[PDB]
Design an enzyme around this catalytic site. Structure first.
Site, short mmCIF file in Angstrom:
data_model
loop_
_atom_site.label_atom_id
_atom_site.label_comp_id
_atom_site.label_asym_id
_atom_site.label_seq_id
_atom_site.Cartn_x
_atom_site.Cartn_y
_atom_site.Cartn_z
N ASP A 290 0.83 -1.20 0.00
CA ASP A 290 0.00 0.00 0.00
C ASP A 290 0.87 1.25 0.00
O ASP A 290 0.54 2.26 -0.65
CB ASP A 290 -0.91 -0.01 1.22
N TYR A 374 -10.12 -1.21 2.62
CA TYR A 374 -9.31 -1.20 3.84
C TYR A 374 -9.15 0.18 4.43
O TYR A 374 -9.00 1.20 3.75
CB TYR A 374 -7.87 -1.71 3.63
#
Ligand SMILES: [Cu+2]
Ligand SMILES: [Cu+2]
Ligand code: NA
Ligand code: NA
Lengths: 621, 621
Positions: A290, A374
């Protein structure tokens, strides 16, 4: 002013201007990363050269460039053309996410797959996910995203409740071509909704929760000067922000009497990886970095007072660049406040008659980011007693799949027909150590059990042992919870009043590291995640444990190539890289929105001070 | 009214009266333990029989007695004479602590040892410590305490800064005789003071800490009825108090819609052991079982509002018996309050446009105890999402020794000439499980790594495995942090809507267990502390992991004798015993008063609920 100050809108506009004037930022160009560079080690002759590093993408297919710019002198320092087939692609652009769904909506293979499932294409959302590196040779040198489909029954519906399993597509986002559509078979689309604001699901809301009011009637005990310099309860530090790493802590130091004593030069979460453990061809490629691939700072939330941050909050609003070089403010992106932390020290002494109680508190610096389903919170804590702690909070909606009818060894069932693949969330902390200065070393400390015998006739003795890590080739270490293994960072040239080297102890949580087979693609690209602790010799260009260009890189970059230099780390300028993560086997309770789970680490002083540093804390008001 | 209500002053006075009338409590008698007995399993025909268990010591040397009394019917149920040479001595009495210093002050051997050190006997304090079981045959059947000496330069001086090493004495506290005085040599007495309220040490107190005000303007969200029944945010439980175990939680249950679902029948810290790792003859015997030998509830502190407990506090003031059967109130002994606990769940969804944030909070039930130099806090936490957590906070003043001139492998130096021996603080949680009822089982869950190959060609898959513990002989388990080992307590006959057994997962901290040689005396007496997890079949008399009479018992009692019965625990009334502890290598920062360190465990629901149980939490005010 401070060279560690946050980038301002003016600096970013000026970078845009320099690049434009130099011929580097025409209409076909896009900024994929922009950030300030840290001051050089002493080499930066104080003075001040605010330098910015820029990754420039070209939407016409020309080679991208790495550019370093000096905004103090208004000049371009260097501009290098990148060979992305060799050194990796640039970070994903926001505008490329939106392209995947649009292209797929007019592709005959995708439409055929949706028709065979009786799905309306106007209701199918596509999660655009980073691609990784696998067996498809056509992708080497190309910017690829992969798409997984979810059905949205209406615009406010949670699509994550309706995965379309058996289907995945690969998209070239520069030439705007659908390279492959894979249909391994039809799975029922789970029908139950997952709408956690729908009264039909929640029931009547509780009326039993009474307010908790946290106020500071005289304001907070910390001061903020120069925009981002914090002073709090003998701590001193600068709070930076980087579009890739998010919050970065600089110059963490503690005022021990008259002297300001450095502890950590730079602290950041330098990478994170989320690997999935489902061997289905539809998802076995699924890994994201990420930080390195998406840039977590770019997706930071604006934090609402009373909701995200409760108490007397001070906010920082960092500035980043958009894809064209215009400044964009993340309003209330960083929350800072102090929190009560229970009892600090307590003793009621019978012989002296003195009863003593003191309360603890911590400084909190936090931000939250959202990427797809998320949501990750990053929390740095400073305590009165010298402890530094990091905590990650993982929440959001679980990534879903169909639940196979015969069961699965790699997927949890959350609802009728609805699965959640097993996965990990693994973080890499990069701690540029400066324990009382830059001559530091790392020791591995193990508990030592002793055998009943001479000099230990009652069999009660136990001890410990410390092993110095002297070269990078021996500094790749594994946890051992059973022997209480910790690591001490000390300064062999700075001694406490007992003539022992001052130090700090790193306490890990000893969670499992990367579970994938060591021969897998993800084990090569996320090599940092296979071990708990790495120590390297400091170098200005060794910033990330995966390398600079993580997107679609074949692997081996970053930490395993740094440590191959086998540099001396015994009493030197060193950097500690700690891997720590969560292994998530989703539970029914994680659905339809998941309660926070946490992981982290802490550093506690270990003979750093000559006695307790909190003797001068007053009794509670 | 509730049979789980706290003992009242009236019940204790009535026990005193029954015992007196029965001829069991004359002037030579002392109550060493008194506590209410829990209701029997269904056998207690509701109705109500408040029964009390009493240990009666005889200060004239006659055999002590175990007596059970019914205060509802005002009768003695049973009175058994104990053979303490076989089954162990009674807990230490408060009045026996004070006797050690007084007897030693007139013993020629002790006075000679003090004269050789130029010490004034009126300035020498003696720490009276439990004796254990070693090689001295004269002690079997006798109540022995051992004494270690500390110098107090003036009445408000911290004696712990001035250990008198090389000297230890053994005292028979019933016949009031000094059995042995051992002098292995003269060590310098450390001269620096450790007075943490002396301005000369603290310096000027900080003026920089501004107040943190935590208020509940509408009062707290929990209700207390019947003296000690708590209802809070769907949780229901009764808070008991036992002079031995301290705070005990009963009938922990969660309201899931209309039904009250049991989770834990009884939760307590049933034992704790503090073993020292210094092989010196002066201290190699040093171990205490604070719960079983001293009774930690008896030394509970009165907790000050704003100092020990901050916020809107509700207090319980438990009643215990003194040594003569008079009730004694521990005023403000238990603190209860709720605390903000950051973010509970959060997601900002791009496709739906819904931004969702909810805040977490926890219920806190705590007490603090002080025994000698040590201060221990016991904290039970209940969270909105069904998590239950225990946390021990260790603080106080470290137990000290001389620091040997050539160094030591088993002692830390804290100050010039001042040592702190290595030690552990180990706890045993006893969790009488009742997951949706009393038919429970325990599974050991390990992460399973998978090899790259057919059905896993990308080498990303991972899984887990659960092993059912079916008999007591297989239910002595060790931690394994590397494979993410946890334990699930489930009810094979109660299923969630997915037709899976409901359960709770125990997450341990995976700290080292008992380090002593397995052949040592402490390894035999503290056998529970050598393994992380034990599961037994419930029995009314199996209350403590060390047995009923820990003081000067030879060992093997408690858990290793219970599990030898090899009872069926697969879907039965079971009890989980979890060992967890701190290994303390003292640091300079622990001196002269130590900052809190913590250890504990938590239980999280694992398919207990049909979905997240916190969907009905409202947005923050
Ligand atoms: Cu997860
Ligand atoms: Cu300790
Ligand atoms: Na460094
Ligand atoms: Na049970």
């Amino acid at each position: 002013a401070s060279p560690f100050r946050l980038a301002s809108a003016g600096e970013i506009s000026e970078v845009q201007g320099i690049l434009r004037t130099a011929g580097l930022l025409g209409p076909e160009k896009r900024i994929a990363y922009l950030g300030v560079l840290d001051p050089a080690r002493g080499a930066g002759s104080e003075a001040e050269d605010r330098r910015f590093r820029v990754f420039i993408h070209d939407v016409s297919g020309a080679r991208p460039q790495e550019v370093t710019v000096s905004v103090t002198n208004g000049t371009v320092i260097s501009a290098v053309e990148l060979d992305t087939a060799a050194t990796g692609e640039l970070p994903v652009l926001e505008e490329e996410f939106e392209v995947v769904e649009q292209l797929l909506a007019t592709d005959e293979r995708w439409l055929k797959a949706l028709a065979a499932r009786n799905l309306d294409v106007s209701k199918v959302r596509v999660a655009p996910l980073s691609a990784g590196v696998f067996e498809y040779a056509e992708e080497r040198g190309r910017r690829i995203l992969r798409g997984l489909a979810f059905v949205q029954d209406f615009p406010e519906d949670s699509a994550w409740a309706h995965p379309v399993d058996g289907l995945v597509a690969y998209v070239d986002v520069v030439s705007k071509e659908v390279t492959r559509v894979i249909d391994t078979g039809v799975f029922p689309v789970p029908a139950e909704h997952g709408n956690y604001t729908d009264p039909e699901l929640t029931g009547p809301l509780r009326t039993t929760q009474k307010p908790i009011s946290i106020t500071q009637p005289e304001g907070p005990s910390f001061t903020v000067t120069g925009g981002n310099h914090i002073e709090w309860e003998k701590w001193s530090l600068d709070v930076g922000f980087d579009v890739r790493e998010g919050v970065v802590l600089h110059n963490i130091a503690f005022r021990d009497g008259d002297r300001l004593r450095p502890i950590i030069n730079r602290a950041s979460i330098a990478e994170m990886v989320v690997p999935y453990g489902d061997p289905s061809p539809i998802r076995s490629w699924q890994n994201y970095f990420d930080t390195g691939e998406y840039l977590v700072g770019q997706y930071a939330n604006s934090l609402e007072l009373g909701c995200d941050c409760l108490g007397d909050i001070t906010y920082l609003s960092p500035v980043i660049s958009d894809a064209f070089g215009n400044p964009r403010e993340i309003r209330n992106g960083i929350c800072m406040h102090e929190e009560d932390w229970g009892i600090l020290a307590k003793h009621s002494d019978l012989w002296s008659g003195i009863n003593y109680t003191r309360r603890n508190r911590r400084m909190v610096i936090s931000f939250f980011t959202t990427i797809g389903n998320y949501d990750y919170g990053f929390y740095w804590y400073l305590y009165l007693d010298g402890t530094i702690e990091f905590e990650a909070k993982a929440t959001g909606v679980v990534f879903t799949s169909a639940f196979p009818e015969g069961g699965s060894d790699n997927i949890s069932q959350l609802a009728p027909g609805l699965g959640a693949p097993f996965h990990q969330h693994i973080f890499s902390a990069r701690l540029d150590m400066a324990i009382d200065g830059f001559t530091n070393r790392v020791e591995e400390e193990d508990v030592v059990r002793q055998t009943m015998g001479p000099g230990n006739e009652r069999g009660n003795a136990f001890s410990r042992k410390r092993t110095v890590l002297t070269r990078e080739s021996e500094a790749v270490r594994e946890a051992d919870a059973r022997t209480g293994r910790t690591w001490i960072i000390s300064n062999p040239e700075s001694k406490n009043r007992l003539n022992e080297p001052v130090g700090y102890k790193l306490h890990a949580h000893n969670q499992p590291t990367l579970l994938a087979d060591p021969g897998s693609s993800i084990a090569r690209r996320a090599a940092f995640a296979t071990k708990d602790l790495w120590v390297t010799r400091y170098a200005d260009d060794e910033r990330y444990p995966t390398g600079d260009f993580v997107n679609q890189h074949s692997g081996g970059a970053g930490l395993p190539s740094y440590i191959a230099q086998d540099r001396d780390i015994d009493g030197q300028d060193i950097v500690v890289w700690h891997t720590f993560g969560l292994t998530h086997f989703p539970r029914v309770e994680d659905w339809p929105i998941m309660p926070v789970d946490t992981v982290g680490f802490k550093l506690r002083p270990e003979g750093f001070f000559d006695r307790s540093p909190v003797l001068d804390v007053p009794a509670n008001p």
